[PDB]
Amino acid sequence: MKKIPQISDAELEVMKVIWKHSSINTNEVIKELSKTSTWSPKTIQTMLLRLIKKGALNHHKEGRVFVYTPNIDESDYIEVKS
DNA sequence: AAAGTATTACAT
DNA sequence: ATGTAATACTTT
């Protein structure tokens, strides 16, 4: 069992907010990420979109509005030792 | 239509 | 994967 998405500083930071919530919808994601980190609504989206494109996260259009669901669970950033 | 929340593309 | 941008759908 290894890490699928390549984690970084900005990569992990957003995951934390998604994991804080059960899953997350763009308003909760942006609303949180914008207050915590610099990143504007534009800036925020790459960490979501590219991750999804490469398999880190997965989006789903749920009944009301959409939910971004963590496509990773076992890994959830494998911080290797020096 | 406005405001808010969702969705994907382009450039780096 | 990261930063930045554009556009659509949903609810009000």
PDB file of C-alpha atoms (C1' of nucleotides) in Angstrom:
ATOM      1  CA  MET A   1       0.000   0.000   0.000  1.00  0.00           C
ATOM      2  CA  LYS A   2       1.561   3.260  -1.291  1.00  0.00           C
ATOM      3  CA  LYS A   3       0.447   6.870  -1.918  1.00  0.00           C
ATOM      4  CA  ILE A   4      -1.429   7.484  -5.202  1.00  0.00           C
ATOM      5  CA  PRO A   5      -1.304  11.347  -5.418  1.00  0.00           C
ATOM      6  CA  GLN A   6       2.029  13.174  -5.009  1.00  0.00           C
ATOM      7  CA  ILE A   7       1.657  15.228  -1.806  1.00  0.00           C
ATOM      8  CA  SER A   8       3.200  18.653  -1.109  1.00  0.00           C
ATOM      9  CA  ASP A   9       2.615  21.538   1.350  1.00  0.00           C
ATOM     10  CA  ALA A  10      -0.443  22.978  -0.455  1.00  0.00           C
ATOM     11  CA  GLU A  11      -1.639  19.444  -1.355  1.00  0.00           C
ATOM     12  CA  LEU A  12      -1.914  18.273   2.282  1.00  0.00           C
ATOM     13  CA  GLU A  13      -3.388  21.559   3.620  1.00  0.00           C
ATOM     14  CA  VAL A  14      -6.622  21.268   1.580  1.00  0.00           C
ATOM     15  CA  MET A  15      -7.003  17.520   2.343  1.00  0.00           C
ATOM     16  CA  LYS A  16      -7.096  18.416   6.059  1.00  0.00           C
ATOM     17  CA  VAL A  17     -10.149  20.681   5.536  1.00  0.00           C
ATOM     18  CA  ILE A  18     -11.888  17.976   3.445  1.00  0.00           C
ATOM     19  CA  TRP A  19     -11.119  15.350   6.139  1.00  0.00           C
ATOM     20  CA  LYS A  20     -12.341  17.772   8.874  1.00  0.00           C
ATOM     21  CA  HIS A  21     -15.779  17.744   7.166  1.00  0.00           C
ATOM     22  CA  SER A  22     -17.483  14.377   6.301  1.00  0.00           C
ATOM     23  CA  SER A  23     -16.749  15.211   2.665  1.00  0.00           C
ATOM     24  CA  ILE A  24     -16.933  18.829   1.294  1.00  0.00           C
ATOM     25  CA  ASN A  25     -18.904  21.018  -1.245  1.00  0.00           C
ATOM     26  CA  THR A  26     -17.038  23.933  -3.035  1.00  0.00           C
ATOM     27  CA  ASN A  27     -18.603  26.593  -0.746  1.00  0.00           C
ATOM     28  CA  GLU A  28     -17.290  24.889   2.405  1.00  0.00           C
ATOM     29  CA  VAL A  29     -13.965  24.153   0.666  1.00  0.00           C
ATOM     30  CA  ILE A  30     -13.427  27.729  -0.622  1.00  0.00           C
ATOM     31  CA  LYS A  31     -14.962  29.292   2.516  1.00  0.00           C
ATOM     32  CA  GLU A  32     -12.336  27.405   4.625  1.00  0.00           C
ATOM     33  CA  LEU A  33      -9.261  27.398   2.321  1.00  0.00           C
ATOM     34  CA  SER A  34      -9.615  31.174   1.652  1.00  0.00           C
ATOM     35  CA  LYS A  35      -9.738  32.091   5.375  1.00  0.00           C
ATOM     36  CA  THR A  36      -6.849  29.788   6.353  1.00  0.00           C
ATOM     37  CA  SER A  37      -4.497  30.062   3.323  1.00  0.00           C
ATOM     38  CA  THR A  38      -3.852  32.979   0.912  1.00  0.00           C
ATOM     39  CA  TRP A  39      -5.249  31.238  -2.242  1.00  0.00           C
ATOM     40  CA  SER A  40      -8.198  33.021  -3.939  1.00  0.00           C
ATOM     41  CA  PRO A  41     -11.259  31.124  -5.384  1.00  0.00           C
ATOM     42  CA  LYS A  42      -9.248  30.665  -8.618  1.00  0.00           C
ATOM     43  CA  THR A  43      -6.033  29.520  -6.851  1.00  0.00           C
ATOM     44  CA  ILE A  44      -7.995  27.047  -4.692  1.00  0.00           C
ATOM     45  CA  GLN A  45      -9.425  25.036  -7.579  1.00  0.00           C
ATOM     46  CA  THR A  46      -6.169  23.564  -9.006  1.00  0.00           C
ATOM     47  CA  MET A  47      -5.547  21.633  -5.769  1.00  0.00           C
ATOM     48  CA  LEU A  48      -9.025  20.104  -6.311  1.00  0.00           C
ATOM     49  CA  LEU A  49      -9.257  19.740 -10.136  1.00  0.00           C
ATOM     50  CA  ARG A  50      -5.757  18.355 -10.873  1.00  0.00           C
ATOM     51  CA  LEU A  51      -5.877  15.989  -7.899  1.00  0.00           C
ATOM     52  CA  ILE A  52      -9.209  14.695  -9.282  1.00  0.00           C
ATOM     53  CA  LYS A  53      -7.747  14.514 -12.826  1.00  0.00           C
ATOM     54  CA  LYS A  54      -4.793  12.458 -11.458  1.00  0.00           C
ATOM     55  CA  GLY A  55      -6.889  10.451  -8.909  1.00  0.00           C
ATOM     56  CA  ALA A  56      -6.199  12.116  -5.488  1.00  0.00           C
ATOM     57  CA  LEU A  57      -9.876  13.171  -4.971  1.00  0.00           C
ATOM     58  CA  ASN A  58     -13.215  12.379  -6.719  1.00  0.00           C
ATOM     59  CA  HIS A  59     -16.225  14.699  -7.326  1.00  0.00           C
ATOM     60  CA  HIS A  60     -19.889  13.590  -7.235  1.00  0.00           C
ATOM     61  CA  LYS A  61     -23.034  15.606  -8.075  1.00  0.00           C
ATOM     62  CA  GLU A  62     -25.160  14.737  -5.025  1.00  0.00           C
ATOM     63  CA  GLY A  63     -28.940  15.497  -4.878  1.00  0.00           C
ATOM     64  CA  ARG A  64     -28.696  19.076  -3.524  1.00  0.00           C
ATOM     65  CA  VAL A  65     -25.222  20.335  -4.635  1.00  0.00           C
ATOM     66  CA  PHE A  66     -21.931  18.428  -5.266  1.00  0.00           C
ATOM     67  CA  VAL A  67     -19.621  16.740  -2.868  1.00  0.00           C
ATOM     68  CA  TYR A  68     -15.883  16.227  -3.270  1.00  0.00           C
ATOM     69  CA  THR A  69     -15.062  12.816  -1.748  1.00  0.00           C
ATOM     70  CA  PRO A  70     -11.516  11.669  -0.742  1.00  0.00           C
ATOM     71  CA  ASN A  71     -10.511   8.995  -3.328  1.00  0.00           C
ATOM     72  CA  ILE A  72      -7.711   8.023  -0.857  1.00  0.00           C
ATOM     73  CA  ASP A  73      -8.242   6.518   2.629  1.00  0.00           C
ATOM     74  CA  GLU A  74      -5.493   3.983   3.427  1.00  0.00           C
ATOM     75  CA  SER A  75      -2.672   6.344   2.389  1.00  0.00           C
ATOM     76  CA  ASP A  76      -3.932   9.863   3.334  1.00  0.00           C
ATOM     77  CA  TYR A  77      -0.370  11.205   2.882  1.00  0.00           C
ATOM     78  CA  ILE A  78       2.426   8.738   3.714  1.00  0.00           C
ATOM     79  CA  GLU A  79       5.075  10.994   5.292  1.00  0.00           C
ATOM     80  CA  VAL A  80       8.270   8.928   4.884  1.00  0.00           C
ATOM     81  CA  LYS A  81      11.177   9.313   7.351  1.00  0.00           C
ATOM     82  CA  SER A  82      14.604  10.803   6.525  1.00  0.00           C
TER      83      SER A  82
ATOM     84  C1'  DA B   1     -31.241  37.825 -12.633  1.00  0.00           C
ATOM     85  C1'  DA B   2     -28.288  37.689  -8.222  1.00  0.00           C
ATOM     86  C1'  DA B   3     -25.958  35.230  -5.129  1.00  0.00           C
ATOM     87  C1'  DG B   4     -23.961  31.180  -4.010  1.00  0.00           C
ATOM     88  C1'  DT B   5     -22.077  26.775  -4.986  1.00  0.00           C
ATOM     89  C1'  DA B   6     -20.345  23.521  -8.909  1.00  0.00           C
ATOM     90  C1'  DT B   7     -17.352  22.267 -12.864  1.00  0.00           C
ATOM     91  C1'  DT B   8     -13.606  22.121 -16.028  1.00  0.00           C
ATOM     92  C1'  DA B   9      -9.598  24.392 -18.890  1.00  0.00           C
ATOM     93  C1'  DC B  10      -5.281  26.735 -19.521  1.00  0.00           C
ATOM     94  C1'  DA B  11      -0.735  28.010 -18.255  1.00  0.00           C
ATOM     95  C1'  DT B  12       3.125  27.112 -15.122  1.00  0.00           C
TER      96       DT B  12
ATOM     97  C1'  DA C   1       0.771  18.937  -8.506  1.00  0.00           C
ATOM     98  C1'  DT C   2       0.414  24.326  -8.268  1.00  0.00           C
ATOM     99  C1'  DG C   3      -1.415  28.924  -9.579  1.00  0.00           C
ATOM    100  C1'  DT C   4      -4.819  31.402 -12.024  1.00  0.00           C
ATOM    101  C1'  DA C   5      -9.120  31.835 -14.954  1.00  0.00           C
ATOM    102  C1'  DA C   6     -13.629  30.900 -17.079  1.00  0.00           C
ATOM    103  C1'  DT C   7     -18.133  29.032 -17.259  1.00  0.00           C
ATOM    104  C1'  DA C   8     -22.221  26.305 -15.678  1.00  0.00           C
ATOM    105  C1'  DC C   9     -25.652  24.660 -12.496  1.00  0.00           C
ATOM    106  C1'  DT C  10     -28.609  25.262  -8.153  1.00  0.00           C
ATOM    107  C1'  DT C  11     -31.053  27.655  -5.106  1.00  0.00           C
ATOM    108  C1'  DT C  12     -33.175  31.775  -3.971  1.00  0.00           C
TER     109       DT C  12
END
